[PDB]
Amino acid sequence: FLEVIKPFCVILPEIQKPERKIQFKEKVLWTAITLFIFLVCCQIPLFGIMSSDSADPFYWMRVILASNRGTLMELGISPIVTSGLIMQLLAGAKIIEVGDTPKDRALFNGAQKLFGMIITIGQSIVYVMSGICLLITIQLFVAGLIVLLLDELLQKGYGLGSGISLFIATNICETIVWKAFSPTTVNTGRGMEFEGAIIALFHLLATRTDKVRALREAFYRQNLPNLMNLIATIFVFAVVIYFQGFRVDLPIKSARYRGQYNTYPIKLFYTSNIPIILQSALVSNLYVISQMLSARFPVGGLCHYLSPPESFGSVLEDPVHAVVYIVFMLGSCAFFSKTWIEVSGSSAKDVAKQLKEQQMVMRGHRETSMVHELNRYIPTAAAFGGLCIGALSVLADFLGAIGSGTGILLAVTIIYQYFEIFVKEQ
Amino acid sequence: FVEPSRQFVKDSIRLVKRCTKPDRKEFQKIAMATAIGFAIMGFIGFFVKLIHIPINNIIVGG
C-alpha cells in the first residue's frame, strides 16, 4: 500500500533547497521567475484540431484555471488541484495509511508526484479526445512536470503563499483584467470592438450620439461584461476584506517572561477555505469531466444537481436546481471545514502543541486546559467559516459583480493570505 | 434529531460577538493594497494579449 510502490517510483525528483538560507528579496526573485513562466505558460497549443466548445467544464473549470482549450496551463490547474485534494483526502482519511520518517514520507511525496503526473496525462488524453493524436501527450506531461516542479520549488524553496494558490490568484487577476481592458469584439448587429472594458465604455461615448442609449448599453450590457458587473465585483471585494478582519483575539502571558502580550488571533477564514471552496468546485468539475463518458454508454439530466443555474432571474424556471445548488454550496464548505481542520493544522491539539512548543500559555488557566479554553471556537469557526463563504459565493452568482463567482471570492482570498505572507518578512 | 440545529445556530451567534470586526482601515489597507496586488498579477493578461495572438498569426500564417 505504501511499502512497495513508493521505493521503486523515484524517477526524476526535485532538488531540495540550498544553504543560502536567510534572504529578503531573492525570495521574491524565485517568485517572479515563476510569474514569468505564467506569463508564458498561458499561451497557445500546437495542434490544429479546432473543436467547437472550448472545454466542457469551462466555466467552473475556467474559474479554477482559465486556459480552456488553450495554453500549457490547459483548461485549468484542475489536474494539480484535484490530484492534490484527493491525495490529502486519502492521506487524512485512513483508506490509505502516517509516514513520519524522512524517507516513507519522501517516497510518499514521490507517489504524490506519480499520481499527479498520471492524472495530468489522463486529463490531456481526455481533452484531446482524430488521427493527429501524436505528441499532445508528450506536451502535456512536459507541461505537467513543469507545474509540478514549480509548485514544489515554491514550498521547500521560496514558498510563502504556495506555488499553487498564487498561480490561481494571478490568473484570476488576469481574468478580471481581460474584462478590464477589452480590445476586440466580433461585430454583432452594431458596435464592433468594445466588450465590457471601461475603454469600451469610453470609446462608446466617442462614437455614438444619444448619450442616454450610450448609458444604457454601458450599464445594462448582458452578453459581454458589464460595468454594473464591475461595480458589483468591486463591492464584493470590499465586503470580503470586511470579513477577513473578523478575528478572535486571545492574549497570552508568555511563559518565563513578565507580561508580553502577543495575542494569538483566530481569523474566521480558517485557512480561507482553499480546501473547502475547491472542495465545492472540483467534485462538480470531475463529473463534468466524466459526462464525456456519458455521451456513449451528459450535459442534460445530470446537470440539474451539478452546477449553478446561471440565471440573473432569481425566479428562473427551476427552483429545485437553485435550492439544491445553494444548500450544497453551504453544506459543502461547512462540512469540509469540520473535516478539514483535523489534517492541515490548527485543530485543538494542533494549536495546543504549537503554543507549548513555542512557550505561550493562557493566563486564565493551566497549560493543558488551553484546549478547553479554545476548543469552543475552532470547529464553528471552521464550519460557519466554511458555510458563509459558499453562501457568499451564492451572492457571487445570484448577482452577476464578480469578474466571476466563487472562484473570484477565493482567489482574492488567496491574495489576502498572500499579503500576510509577503508582509511577514516585512 | 432536531436539536443540533439549535446548537449550531446558537453556536454561531456566540462567536460572532467575540470577534473584533472593526471599521475601515484594515478594510482600507487590504482593499487598496490587494487590488494593487491583483493588478500585479493582472496586466500579465494584457501582455499575453500583446504577444500570443500576433505570434499565433505567425504560427498559422507560416
Binding site: 526535485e14 533547497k17 540550498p18 508564458v40 497557445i44 513543469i146 | 498559422v60 507560416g62
Partner: peptide, 29 residues
C-alpha cells in the same frame, strides 16, 4: 532545488515549445 537547473530546465522546455512552435511555421504562411 539544491540547484536551479530544474527551473532552467522548465525554461528550456518552454523554448523548445516556443521555438519549435514557429519552427514548423517557418515553411508555412
Amino acid at each position: 532545488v539544491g540547484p536551479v537547473p530544474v527551473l532552467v530546465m522548465s525554461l528550456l522546455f518552454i523554448a523548445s515549445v516556443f521555438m519549435l512552435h514557429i519552427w514548423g511555421k517557418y515553411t508555412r504562411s
